[PDB]
């Protein structure tokens, strides 16, 4: 009858009771992890983002399996050995398997990365809290190059942690991310424009200096802020974000007259079919590199359009480039097919 | 299956002498990375054999590994599973750190299964990764000439070249390696010179 | 042609527009691509997929639970799933899934009664499939006996 | 204790023995109704046992001590 009092009882039982989630296929032990369950109305399981990596779980319709550890022994096996908080590092390599991906990386990249002047270049801030106050007030961009006073906490020769205070030349964004950073980590780790590769080293460092509790809380914080700023950013994919280099058709007509030269040298019966095959493939392979390099110089540094005195050069904030550069999604290889030349395809034979 | 941590210390002196890995050109596996969290078998000190640098049964921690780089250690005997004397399993010492825990392995842990899962998984998953997605064919094997970046003395090993008519050192050996000695003298870069290659110097 | 059609609509060439967060009211930092994508609801409704079981019917010879939501089935805990518990060292969880959760007929009922009595005690025995294995091997004319302690 | 078990593992050491010790104690509170040392703060027996081990009140050896203490006093009473 699903009586009202029964739900209150169910709520009582599931507290502090771990449940096992499993994804097929179970390739390594992290394919099963324990969580504390949170009851939700609605028929789908909700999974924590950061362990998506261990399960290889993407929500394009994936399903997972639930198991209840019954005995006191089984409950403690789940909470102590199999809990997600307890199992971070890959047993295969000494590496943290729990790492921000996708939106999270994009958000942190967006916040840390700097821009020419923009709103409120060269200001001076009392704390990262004044910085947050300034950004959300609308008197500073996250990419404004402004000097802030942060107090970093460095571990000494003994257990005692040393605190030091100095003026850092970071941006508003980096100041706000410092708020997520635990005391004990240096400020210099967040002071660079952050990508996926730098964030994993962030977590590793955190783990070896502070230990487990701090890393777990820190990881969660990073996820929250990462999403939050990814959404603020308004990042999108328009067809104008795919930039073709102006010099495609020239490179191609040139490469096409070149291939014609070797076809003519074949028809003369001097160059063998195999030599021409190899030299046509070499001509196109070089054409492909050149077109890709042309696209990437034209895209990477296309913000040749700045300010303050007169014209200056900077990194492009083109959406697809940000996505690839941050390591959130895509790579230069993908962008080649999108905006550049697709390139030489391979037959089912393996032959090109 | 059966292999489990049975003992704490087998009391063996045995172990494999590991060396830094330099495949291609970029340091793929550093000695520290290869040896981290491994028990150091036999008092392994510094070049000058006249003072013990490191002890016996001592788990290689990150601090210890950092010291190895300052001292520039060539190669180190490390306790291995293969050289364990424990019958019907292996000792925590010969294995070393549970990589998943970040400290020395607990006795009772079923290591063999972990090992097989660890070796097997990447293969099984990579069979799915570059294949649902595997599309564009981007091969790269135009290795025509080796260019040295750091100045140094040319050091060839297991090589038997012969001077030609042109005046160049033509190698007549299959497996030919080319090292890059620095000022003091230590291998920094390493390449693979094939048979019938022309050496400039 | 599409940009020309957008201009007839007085919409931007970029097809990106200024959007405002419903919660805060402030604008998002940059233009977002907005438009009409024709979308489909696939036959995979969650109503058809969600399934759950504590205790139910059991299979005929092996005595382990049946499979499938249509038969009110238990999830298969397969060899690969077993190995994971072996790596972990989680021994009681594993034993539980082999015995009181599956075949062990004495074990399951006794365990159920213990759960209703709060005491989460493990009271295991031998899975009924192993008993069968033995009988199958002796039917082959191979003597397989248990030597006790 | 609830979220992270690392400090509790650092008291006993062997994760495997931590589980056996906390299970045997949790069984005592579950069945014997043995009284908790730490304020429950509305937590289940399993969590109480882990808190007790974290603070260093429960131990394999200490459990075995109180087992013989109580069993021997009952033998004394019978004779």
């Amino acid at each position: 009858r699903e009586e009202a009092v029964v739900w209150d009882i169910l709520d009582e039982v599931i507290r502090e009771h771990p449940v096992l989630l499993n994804r097929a296929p179970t390739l390594h032990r992290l394919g099963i992890q324990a969580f504390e369950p949170v009851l939700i109305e609605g028929k789908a399981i909700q999974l924590h983002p950061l362990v998506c990596a261990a399960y290889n779980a993407d929500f394009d319709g994936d399903q997972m399996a639930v198991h209840v550890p019954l005995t006191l022994e089984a409950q403690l096996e789940a909470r102590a050995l199999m809990m997600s908080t307890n199992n971070i590092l890959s047993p295969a390599n000494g590496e943290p398997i729990i790492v921000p991906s996708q939106d999270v990386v994009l958000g942190l990249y967006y916040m840390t990365r700097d821009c020419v002047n923009a709103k409120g270049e060269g200001m001076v801030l009392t704390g990262p809290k004044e910085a947050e106050r300034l950004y959300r007030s609308g008197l500073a961009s996250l990419h404004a190059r402004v000097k802030v006073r942060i107090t970093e906490y460095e571990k000494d020769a003994n257990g005692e942690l040393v605190a030091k205070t100095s003026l850092k030349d970071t941006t508003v964004g980096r100041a706000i991310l410092w708020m997520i950073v635990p005391k004990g980590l240096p400020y210099s780790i967040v002071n660079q424009a952050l990508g996926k590769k730098a964030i994993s080293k962030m977590l590793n460092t955190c783990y070896r200096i502070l230990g487990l509790k701090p890393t777990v809380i820190f990881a969660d914080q990073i996820m929250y802020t990462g999403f939050a700023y990814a959404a603020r950013s308004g990042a999108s994919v328009g067809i104008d974000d795919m930039v073709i280099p102006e010099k495609k058709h020239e490179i191609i007509s040139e490469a096409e007259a070149e291939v014609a030269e070797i076809q003519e040298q074949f028809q003369s019966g001097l160059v063998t079919a195999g030599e021409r095959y190899n030299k046509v493939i070499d001509i196109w392979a070089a054409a492909n590199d050149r077109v890709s390099k042309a696209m990437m110089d034209n895209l990477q540094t296309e913000t040749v359009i700045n300010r303050d005195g007169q014209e200056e050069k900077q990194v492009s904030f083109n959406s697809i480039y940000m996505m690839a550069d941050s390591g959130a999604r895509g790579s230069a290889a993908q962008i080649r097919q999108l905006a550049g030349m697709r390139g030489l395809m391979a037959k089912p034979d393996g032959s090109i | 299956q059966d292999l489990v941590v049975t003992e704490d210390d087998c009391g063996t002196h045995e172990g494999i002498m590991m060396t830094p890995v330099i495949e291609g050109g970029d340091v793929k596996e550093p000695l520290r990375d290869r040896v981290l969290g491994r028990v150091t078998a036999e008092d392994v000190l510094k070049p000058g054999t006249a003072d013990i640098l490191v002890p016996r049964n001592t788990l290689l921690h990150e601090q210890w590994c950092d010291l190895l780089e300052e001292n520039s250690v060539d190669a180190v005997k490390v306790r291995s599973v293969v050289s364990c004397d424990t019958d019907f399993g292996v000792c925590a010492h010969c294995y070393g750190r549970d990589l998943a825990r970040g400290h020395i392995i607990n006795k009772g842990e079923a290591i063999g299964v972990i090992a097989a899962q660890s070796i097997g998984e990447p293969g099984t998953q990579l069979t799915m990764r570059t294949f649902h997605i595997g599309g564009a064919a981007s091969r790269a094997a135009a290795e025509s000439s080796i260019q040295v970046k750091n100045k140094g003395s040319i050091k060839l090993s297991n090589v038997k070249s012969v001077v030609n008519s042109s005046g160049k050192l033509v190698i007549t050996s299959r497996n030919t390696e080319l090292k890059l000695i620095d000022e003091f003298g230590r291998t920094k870069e390493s390449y693979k010179v094939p048979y019938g290659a022309v050496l400039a110097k | 042609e599409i940009k020309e059609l957008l201009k007839l609509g007085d919409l931007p060439t970029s097809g990106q527009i200024r959007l405002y967060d419903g919660r805060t009211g402030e604008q998002f930092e940059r233009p977002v691509t907005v438009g009409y994508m024709y979308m489909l609801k696939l036959n995979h409704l969650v109503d058809d997929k969600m399934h759950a079981r504590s205790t139910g019917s059991y299979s005929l010879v092996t005595q382990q639970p049946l499979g499938g939501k249509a038969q009110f089935g238990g999830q298969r805990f397969g060899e690969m799933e077993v190995w994971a518990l072996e790596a972990y060292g989680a021994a009681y969880t594993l034993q539980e899934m082999l015995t009181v959760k599956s075949d062990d007929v004495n074990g399951r009922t006794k365990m159920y009664k213990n759960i209703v009595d709060g005491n989460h005690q493990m009271e295991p025995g031998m899975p009924e499939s192993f008993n069968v294995l033995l009988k199958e091997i002796r039917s082959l004319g191979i003597n397989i006996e248990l030597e006790d302690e | 204790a609830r979220v992270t078990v690392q400090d509790a593992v650092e008291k006993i050491g062997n994760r495997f023995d931590l589980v056996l010790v906390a299970a045997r104690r949790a069984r005592q509170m579950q069945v014997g109704g043995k009284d908790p040392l730490v304020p429950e703060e509305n937590d289940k027996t399993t969590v109480i046992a882990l808190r007790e081990i974290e603070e260093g009140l429960i131990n394999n050896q200490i459990l075995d001590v109180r087992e013989r203490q109580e069993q021997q006093e009952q033998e004394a009473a019978e004779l």
Partner: peptide, 19 residues
Amino acid sequence: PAGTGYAYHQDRMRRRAAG
């Protein structure tokens, strides 16, 4: 005979060793 079970399994092995 591993992980959680190593405690119980060695306690059986000593019961086996002593009769």
